[PDB]
Amino acid sequence: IECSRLGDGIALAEFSRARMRELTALMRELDADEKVRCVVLYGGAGRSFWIDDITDLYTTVAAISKPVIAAIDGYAIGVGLQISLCCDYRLGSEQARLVMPEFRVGIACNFGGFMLEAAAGRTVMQRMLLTCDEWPAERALADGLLHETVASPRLLDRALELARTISGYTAEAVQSTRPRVNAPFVAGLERIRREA
Amino acid sequence: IECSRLGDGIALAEFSGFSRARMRELTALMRELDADEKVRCVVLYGGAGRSFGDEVNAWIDDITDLYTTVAAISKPVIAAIDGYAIGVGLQISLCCDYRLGSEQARLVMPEFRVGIACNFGGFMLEAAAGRTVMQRMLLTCDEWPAERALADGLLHETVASPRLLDRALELARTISGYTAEAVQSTRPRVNAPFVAGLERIRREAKESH
Amino acid sequence: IECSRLGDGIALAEFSRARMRELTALMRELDADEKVRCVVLYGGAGRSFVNAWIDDITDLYTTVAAISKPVIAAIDGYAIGVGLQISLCCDYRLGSEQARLVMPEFRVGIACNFGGFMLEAAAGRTVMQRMLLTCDEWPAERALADGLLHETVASPRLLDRALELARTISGYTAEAVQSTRPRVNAPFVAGLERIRREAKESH
Numbered sequence: 001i002e003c004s005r006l007g008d009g010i011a012l013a014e015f016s017r018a019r020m021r022e023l024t025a026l027m028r029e030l031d032a033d034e035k036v037r038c039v040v041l042y043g044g045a046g047r048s049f050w051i052d053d054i055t056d057l058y059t060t061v062a063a064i065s066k067p068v069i070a071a072i073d074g075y076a077i078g079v080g081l082q083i084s085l086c087c088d089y090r091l092g093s094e095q096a097r098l099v100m101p102e103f104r105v106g107i108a109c110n111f112g113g114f115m116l117e118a119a120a121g122r123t124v125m126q127r128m129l130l131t132c133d134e135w136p137a138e139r140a141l142a143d144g145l146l147h148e149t150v151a152s153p154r155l156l157d158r159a160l161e162l163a164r165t166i167s168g169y170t171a172e173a174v175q176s177t178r179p180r181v182n183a184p185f186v187a188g189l190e191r192i193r194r195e196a
Numbered sequence: 197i198e199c200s201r202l203g204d205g206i207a208l209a210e211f212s213g214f215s216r217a218r219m220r221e222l223t224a225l226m227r228e229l230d231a232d233e234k235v236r237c238v239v240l241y242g243g244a245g246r247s248f249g250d251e252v253n254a255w256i257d258d259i260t261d262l263y264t265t266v267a268a269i270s271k272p273v274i275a276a277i278d279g280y281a282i283g284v285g286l287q288i289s290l291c292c293d294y295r296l297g298s299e300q301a302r303l304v305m306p307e308f309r310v311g312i313a314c315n316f317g318g319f320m321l322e323a324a325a326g327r328t329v330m331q332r333m334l335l336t337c338d339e340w341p342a343e344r345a346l347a348d349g350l351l352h353e354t355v356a357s358p359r360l361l362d363r364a365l366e367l368a369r370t371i372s373g374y375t376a377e378a379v380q381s382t383r384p385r386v387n388a389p390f391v392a393g394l395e396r397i398r399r400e401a402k403e404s405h
Numbered sequence: 406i407e408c409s410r411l412g413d414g415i416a417l418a419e420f421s422r423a424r425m426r427e428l429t430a431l432m433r434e435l436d437a438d439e440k441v442r443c444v445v446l447y448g449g450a451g452r453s454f455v456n457a458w459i460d461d462i463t464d465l466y467t468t469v470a471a472i473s474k475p476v477i478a479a480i481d482g483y484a485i486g487v488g489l490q491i492s493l494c495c496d497y498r499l500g501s502e503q504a505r506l507v508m509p510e511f512r513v514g515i516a517c518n519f520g521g522f523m524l525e526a527a528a529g530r531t532v533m534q535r536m537l538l539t540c541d542e543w544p545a546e547r548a549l550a551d552g553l554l555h556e557t558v559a560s561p562r563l564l565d566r567a568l569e570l571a572r573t574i575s576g577y578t579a580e581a582v583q584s585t586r587p588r589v590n591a592p593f594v595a596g597l598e599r600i601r602r603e604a605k606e607s608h
Contacts, residue, residue, distance in 0.1 A: 067538065088534050103382075106375035113386040118530055122324055122390075123349035126293050129382070130272065130371055144531035166538055170514035177511075177537070180603060181521040185530075195385055308585075311578035318589035327527055328552035331496050334585070335475065335574055397588075404584040 001026060009037030009167035010160060014044060016079070017053060024057045031064040037167040037174070039068045040159050041087065045152070046095075049076040049084055055193040058111065061086035062182045062189065065175040067166055071159040072096045073152060078105075078112065085115040088178065090145070091159050093152040098135040098145050100128045110192050118185055120144045199225055205236030205372035206365065214249055214284050219258040222288075223265050230269040236372040236379070238273045239364050240292060242285075245300065245357070248277045249285030252405050259284070260398045263316065266291035268391045270380040272371050276364040277301040278357060283310075283317070290320040293383065295350065296364050298357040303340035303350050305333045313404035315397050323390055325349040408435070414442035415571045419449060425461045428491075429468045436472040442575040442582070444472075445567050446495060447479045450560075451503070454484040454492055456605050462487070462519065463601040469494035470590045470597070473583035475574050479567040480504040481560055486513075486520065493523040494593075496586070498553070499567050501560035506543040506553050508536045518600050526593055528552040 001022050003013045011030050013023075030036050043049040049072045061068060061083065070076075070084035072092040077099045084090050100116060102109035109129050116125035124143045128135065140146040150158045166174065197212040207229055209222075229235050242248040266273060266288065275292040282304045289295050305321060307314035314334055321330035329348045333340065345351040355363045371379065407419045408431055416435050420428065435441045448454035469476055469491060478495035485507045492498050500506075508524060510517035517537055524533035532551045536543065548554040558566045574582070587594075 089538055103371075103374040103378055106378050108378050108381045110382055110385050113382055117386070120531070121326060121349055121529065123352055125386075127352050130294055130367070144529055147531055147535050162538070165540075166511075169511040173511055173514050173516050176516045176607065177518055177521055180518055181525070181533075192385075308577040308581055311581050313581050313585045315585060315588050318585060322589075326529065326552055328555055330589075332555050334589075335497055335570070400588045400591075404588060 003030070005036065006160065008164050009035065010040060010163045011036045011038070012040045012042060012160070014042050015047070015049070017050070020053050020057050024053075024060050027057075027060045027064055027068075031066055037066060037169075037171055038163040039064075039066055040071060040163050041068060041083070042071045042156060042159065043073055043076075043080075046074045048074055049080045051193060051196055054079070054111070055189060058082065058086050058115075058189050059186050062186050063179060065179050067174060067178055069159050069163055069166075071155055072098075072146070073155055075099065078102060082111050082115055085119050089147045089162065091148050091150065091155065091162070092137045092140060092146040093155045094137050094149055095152055096137040096140065096146065096149070098140050099132070101132040103129055104132040108196070110196055111189070114188050114192060116145075118188070197221055197225075199229070201234075202365065202368075204369050205234065205376075206239060206368045207232075207235045207237070208239045208241060208365075210241050211243065211246075211249055216255060216258045219262045223258070223262045226262075226265045226269055226273075230271055233376075235271060236374075236376050237368040238269075238271050239276060239368050240273060240288070241276045241361065241364065242278055242281075245278050247279045247285060248275065248281040249288050253402050256398065256401050256405065259287075259316065260394060260401070263287065263291050263320075263394045264391055267387050267394065268384060270384050272379060272383055274364055274368055274371075276360055277303075277351070278360050280304065283307060287316055287320055290324050294352045294367065296353050296355065296360065296367070297342045297345060297351040298360045299342045299354060300357050301342045301345065301351065301354075303333075303345045304337065306337040308334060309337040313401065315401040315404050316394075319393055319397055321350075323393070410440070411568065411571075413572050414440055414575045415445065415568065416441045416443070417445045417447060417568075419447050422458060422461050425465045429461075429465045432465075432468045432472055432476075436474055441474055442577075442579055443571040444474055444476045445479055445571050446476060446491070447564065447567070448481055448484075448488075450564075451481055453482050454478065454480050454488045455608065459601055459604045463597060466490065466494050466519065466523075466597050467594050471587055471594050473586055475582060475586055477567055477571055477574075479563055480506075480554070481563055483507065486510060490519055490523055493527050497555045497570065499556050499558065499563065499570070500545050500548060500554040501558060501563045502545045503560055504545045504548065504554065504557070506536075506548050507540070509540040511537060512540040518604060519597070522596055522600055526596065 068087040070087040273292040275289040278298040476495040478492040480500040
């Protein structure tokens, strides 16, 4: 996981288990750093995006004071999709596809189910878990699974342009809103750890 | 009332012939179905082109026990709607994991027009379709045709009337095919906040009606 | 400020800390009035809609949402920050094609804890994140598609439509409506009270 400060308060993190814990530590390093004001998680051009390790990562991404942007160019499946659901703004290319196929794979979907209900409501979460169908970018956008869609070439610069706009806001204002607005969400993730 | 095994792990529950004995029987059936390990999916069906589905204090207790059981059982429940789903009828469907509507399906919450309270309706519509749709439904008492109900999240899917039960059983077959432990360790945990919400309404709904 | 009866139990209300207290008091007066069955908050044709500031802002938000009478917000222009937040406490937001919704607290340089909660309760987490982080304007049709507006009408029939609906709401048995509204709104009211404490608790 190669992080790289591009200035203007932006931190671009270009992409398991060790990769989990590395990302959990990098998010805390970025949260403690005064110079950083916005994080961007990029899967790469066309590329894809125990209990305690996964919960620590989900709760970290959602609990840090700084906002996180997930730039999705291809597929975002299960755990990968779940990480993006901990981010404040999911920007997808018109080619992006979202899948939560846990039931078909034969595993429980407690994290996926909770996280999807938060971003898209019970109906969409239920449609996704029970059918295991793929959500194309435009359906994902309409359902609240994506905040915005762009053409694949524009994806990374639109993400950095938004990170810049966010970085240009009074740090205190943003950083005192984000952990408080995400407290109910983080609490819900914590209950899932215990029940499993 | 009448339940039937379709033998893929599918139990089709049908509304025969809303009273308090009807609620208790449905509640007991839901509990019998959660107990039987040969059952992996439940399909609630109104019929062919038919509508879906001190003295007051006992009505509320049976209603609450029905809504809490339908939402708290470990088995997924599919509601198949071929006509009108009004008040209590619509409320039962809002406890199920998947609402499949025919293009003849019409959804209404006319409680206010009828002159009765809508504590449960208000809570359940908010959970399924969001606050705005809930408020539009309660205050206008307008009907929600199938296409509009789908857009707003009141239906998970729409189909043509001749394929309604076919699609219901095809989807029930898909759900039944998943590892039961995977589905059954998810359905009751994911629904716990919704079940807790329904439990708080019990005392509130009593005062209101 | 200016309140008016239109008959059929309809109360049309038209409109700093003192202005917040005046609206809170009016809402309580209308709740106690047996002749009032529906309230219409109107910004007017073509117009817009420290620890003690928190208290008066919470008292207003919780009063608009906790009263037994339904409140319709008629929006003919801009609804920014506090103005947007007031309408988010109302049960029915009716906008004209010239209604524009903005939550630009971050661009202005201030926290958006009330805005964040209220936007999430009304239109979901995603819409909330779009509005807070971009600080963009939501025109009438985009707000309708996102659940920020319940309905859109052409501005010539905006007040007409708000009254048409107020009459429909008023025509219902009052006890059915008035015993439902504070109950359905209690989780929303509880959330606002949590934020009042957490806002004071942080300063």
